[PDB]
Symmetry: C22
Subunit: 88 residues, 22 copies
């Protein structure tokens, strides 16, 4: 029963990261969820020579904040392939 709600979360993370990949500047994403006040931590790896704008961050924040039950956008953490915590 526990490996039921875990084999599922591992699929959500793999599905959520398949869309953020199909998003333009992102080359490959990697998201982990923390569903117990949940949280997430995207780890996008932007394409060579690119950088997400100030409104392109909320694109990837709300793309995950909304696809996960009860996850406000204040808990999503976005990080590049060069450190650089993009959220606040």
């Amino acid at each position: 029963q526990f490996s039921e709600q875990v084999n599922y979360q591992r699929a959500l993370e793999g599905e959520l990261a398949r869309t953020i990949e199909t998003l333009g500047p992102v080359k490959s994403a990697r998201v982990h969820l923390a569903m117990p006040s949940p949280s997430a931590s995207v780890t996008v790896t932007l394409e060579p020579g690119r950088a997400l704008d100030e409104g392109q961050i909320s694109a990837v924040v709300h793309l995950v904040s909304s696809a996960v039950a009860g996850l406000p956008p204040g808990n999503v953490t976005l990080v590049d392939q060069s450190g650089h915590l993009l959220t606040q």
Copy 2:
């Protein structure tokens, strides 16, 4: 029993995204639901050289807000293939 209401949600998402594809400017959509106050996150990928108008957003918002039980249009999140969070 849990994989009952999850194997179903995975089909809704795949059915909802099959209609948004058959919608003109959209080339391929990708929707995730967050049914626990539910939410959704469409990730349309518009056709080459196209952009959804201001009233073409509510088309795709209500197309999902209504096909999901108890989902107001204030929870649907629409995002292009170039970031650009279209909803508010």
Copy 3:
């Protein structure tokens, strides 16, 4: 028991969309129901060079509002193949 009331809803949607197809200007419809205050979202694809009039919308609204138990016509959402949310 759950896949009982879901294998049925998937048939209603496929039956409701078979009639809206046999309706003249419509070439192919695609309806999803949201039976928990229910809702529906038709996605008609009008024939080449056609547009539903102001009274031809209530035709397709009541065609679905009445074929579904407890669904007022204020919850049915009609959308073309070019965005254009036709309902309100």
Copy 4:
């Protein structure tokens, strides 16, 4: 037990629509019931070059309002093959 009262409703709809076909101006009908305050939605397809008169609508309304338990004639919805919601 549920597929008992559903395999039956699917037969009523197919029987009710077999009589409306044998009615003159109608070439082929298509009725769905909404038995939970029930409702119905006939979708007659009139013969080439024909139109139901003002008293020929109540013929098809009462033909269905009476063949279904507890269905007033104010819930039956009649629609042609050209939109044109005939009821009110």
Copy 5:
């Protein structure tokens, strides 16, 4: 047990419609019952060049109102093969 009181009603309807056929002006009848305040809806198809008189309607109304338990004659609905709701 439910298909007991339904396989029976389907036989009553087929028996009631076999007598209305053997009634002179009628060529073929088609009756549905609505036993839950019950109702019925005969759909006689008169012989070529014929029309039921004002007292020939109560013949077919009471022929069904009486053959069904608890069905007043104010609930029976008679309709020709040309629309024309004959009852009131």
Copy 6:
């Protein structure tokens, strides 16, 4: 148990109609019972060139009113092969 009191009623109707046939002016009868305040509806088909007199109606009314438990003669309905409701 239900098909017990129904396989029986179908035999009563077939027995009651076998006597009304052996009654002179009648060529073939057809009676349905409505045993729940019961009722009946005979559908005699008089011989070619014949008509039941005013006292020949009560013959066929009481012939059925008495052969059925608790059925007053005010509930029996007699109808010819030419409409013509004979009872009141």
Copy 7:
């Protein structure tokens, strides 16, 4: 248990009608019982050129009123082969 008290009543009716046949003017009788305040309905078919007198009716009434438990002579109904309800 029900087909016990019905297979018996069908034998009483066939026995009661075998005696009324062996009664002179009667050529063949046909009696149905209505045992729930019971009733009966004899349908004698007098011999060619004969008619039961005023005291020959009570012969056939009491012949049945007494052979059936709790059946007063005011409930027995006698009818010829020419209509003609003989009782009152």
Copy 8:
């Protein structure tokens, strides 16, 4: 258990009628009992050219009134082969 007290009554009737046959003027009797205030109905068929006297009726009445438990002589009904109810 019911066919116990019925297979017996059918034997009493056949035994009671075998004695009334061995009684002189009677050629063949036929008695039915109505044991629930019981009753009986003898149907003697007198020999050719004979008639039971006024005291020869009580012979056949008490012959049956006494051979049946709780049956007063005021409930026995005697009838010839020519109608003619002999009792009162």
Copy 9:
């Protein structure tokens, strides 16, 4: 258990009637009992040219009144082969 006290009564009747036969003027008797206030009904058939005297009746009455439990001599009914109820 019922056919126990009935197979016995049928033997008493056959034994009681075997003694009344061995009684002189009687050629063959035939007695039925009515054991529930019991009763009996002897049906002696006197020898050719004989008649039971006034004190020869009480012989056959007490011969049966005493051989049956609780049967007073006021309930025994004696009848010849020529009607003629001998008791009172």
Copy 10:
């Protein structure tokens, strides 16, 4: 258990009647008992040309009154082969 106290009474009657036979004037007796206030009914058949005296009756009365439990001599009934109730 009932055929226990009946197979026994049938033996008592056959034993009691075997002694009354071995009694002189009697050629063959035939006694029935009525054990529920019991009673008996002897049916002696005296030898050719003989008659029991006034004190020879109490011989056969007490011979049976005493051989049966609880049977006073006022209940024993003695009868010849020529009627003639000998007791009182």
Copy 11:
């Protein structure tokens, strides 16, 4: 259990009558008991040309009154082969 206390009484009677036989004037006795206030009834058959004296009666009375539990000598009944009740 009943045929236990009856197969025994039948042996007592046969034993008691074997002693009264071995008693001189008696040639063969025959005793029946009435054990429920019991009673007995001896039926001695004296030797040819003999008669029991007044004190030879109490011999046979007490011979039985004492061999049976609770049987006073006032209940024993002695009878010859010529009637003649010897006791009182």
Copy 12:
């Protein structure tokens, strides 16, 4: 259990009578017991030409009164082979 205390009493009687035989004047005795206030009844058969004296009676009385539990000498009955009740 009953044939236990009866197969025993039949042995006591046969043992008690074997001693009274070995007593001189007695040639063969025959005793029955009446054990429920018990009693006995000896039936000695004295040797040819002998008679028990007045004190030879108490020999045979106490010989039985004492060999049986609770049997006073006032209940023992002694009788010869010539009647002659010897006790009182």
Copy 13:
């Protein structure tokens, strides 16, 4: 269990009588016990030409009174082979 305390008493009697035999004047004894206030009855058969003295009686009385539980010497009964009750 009863044949336990009876097969034993029959052995006591046979043992007690084997000692009284080995006592001189006695040739053969025969004792019965009456154990329920018990009693005994010896039946000594003295040797040819012998007689027990007045103190030789108490020898045989106490020889039995003491060998039996609860048997006073006032209940033992001694009798010769010539009657002659020796005790009191």
Copy 14:
């Protein structure tokens, strides 16, 4: 269980009598016990030409009074082979 305390008493009696034999003047003893206030009855058979003295009686009394539980010397009964009750 009863034949347990009886097979034992029969051994005590046979053991007690084996010692009294080995006692000088006694040639063979024979003792019975009466264990329920118990008692005993020795039956010594003195050697030819011998007699137990006044103090040789208490030898055989106490030899048995003490070898049996609860048996006072006032209950032991000693008797020779010539009657002669030696105890008191």
Copy 15:
């Protein structure tokens, strides 16, 4: 269980008597116990020409009084082979 405490007592008696034999003047002893206030009865058989002194009695008394539980020396009974009760 009873033959447990009896097979043991029979061994004690045989063991106690084996020691009294090995005691000098005694040639063979024979002791019985009376264990329920117990008692014993030794039956020593002194050697030819010997007699136990006044203090040689208490030797054999205490030899048994002490080897048996709860047996005072006032209950032991010593007897020679010539009567002569040695104890008091």
Copy 16:
């Protein structure tokens, strides 16, 4: 369980008597115990020409009084092979 505490006591007695044998003047001892206030009875058989002194008695008394649970030295009984109770 009883033969448990008896097979043991028989071993104690045989062990206690094996030590008293290995004691000098004693040639063979023989002890019985009376364990229920217990007691013992030694029966030493001194060597030819020997006698236990006044303090050699307490040697054999305490040798047994102490080897047995709860046995005071006032209950041990010592006896030679020549009577002579040594204890007091």
Copy 17:
């Protein structure tokens, strides 16, 4: 059940450390969680000739603080391959 929530934590640690590896300056990470107020301890091994800036630490802190349920960023511990605790 315990190895369920441990086999999972070991996978989280291996997944969390696979992303921190794909982060630029980090060559290989190694994270342990302390889920009972949880904690974590990353052990990044920076690429040859590199050092995480002051805002590149919060990148790796929030990358783990958010991917673990209920883990504040004040509990995450970051350490290089040269000691140097980077967090506070």
Copy 18:
């Protein structure tokens, strides 16, 4: 369970006596215990020409008083091979 604490005591006695043997002047000991206030009784057999001193007695007393649970030295009894109770 009893032969458990007895097979053990028999081993203690055999072990305690094996040490007292290995004690110098003693050649062979023999101890019995009386464990229920316990006691013991050593029976040492001193070597030829030896005698235990006054302090050599307490050696063997405490050697046993201490090796047995709850045994004071006032209960141990020491005896030589020549009587001579050494303890007090």
Copy 19:
């Protein structure tokens, strides 16, 4: 269940010590945990010619304090390969 939370702790210790090895100056670590207020004891073995600085101790303290649930840094004990407790 206990070897569940012990086979796990043995893995934590082996995992925690695998990271401290990959830390630069450390050549091989060895950590034991004391999870019941838990504790740990690292036993680092620094590389040849090296010594952990004052801030390089907190690196290894927090590396373990945080990877273990509920372990403050005041309980971690760090020790070199040359004694030298580094913590406080």
Copy 20:
């Protein structure tokens, strides 16, 4: 269970005595324990020509007092191979 705490005590005694042997002056010890206020009794056998000093006794006392649970040194008893109780 008892032979559990006895097979163990027998091993303690054999182990405790194996150390006292390896103690110098002692050649072979032999200890018994009295564990119920326990006690012990060592039986050392000193080497030829040796004697334990006053402080060499407490060596062997405390060597046993401490190796046994709850055994004070005031209960240990030490004895040589020449009597000589060494403890107090």
Copy 21:
């Protein structure tokens, strides 16, 4: 279950002693734990020609005090291979 928490403690002791060996001056350690207020006792065997300093003792004390749950450093006991208790 007990050998569970003992097979584990034996492994802790063997693991704790494997680290103290890898500590420089120590050549081989040997630790025992006393987990019930626990305790430990290390028994280090320093390398040839070495001695632990005053701060090198707390290294080995805290190395064990911390690796064992609930063991203060005041309970650890350190001892060399030359006695010399190093702790206090």
Copy 22:
């Protein structure tokens, strides 16, 4: 279960004595524990020509006092191979 906590104590004793052997002056130790206020008794056997100093005793005392749960150093007993209790 008992041989569980005994097979363990026997291993502790064998392990504790293996360390005291590896201690320098000691050649072979031998310790017994008394775990119920526990105690121990070491029996060291010093090397040829050696003696434990005053502070070398507490080495071996605390080496055992600490390796055993709840054993104060005031209960440990140390003894050489020459008596000489070293503790107090």
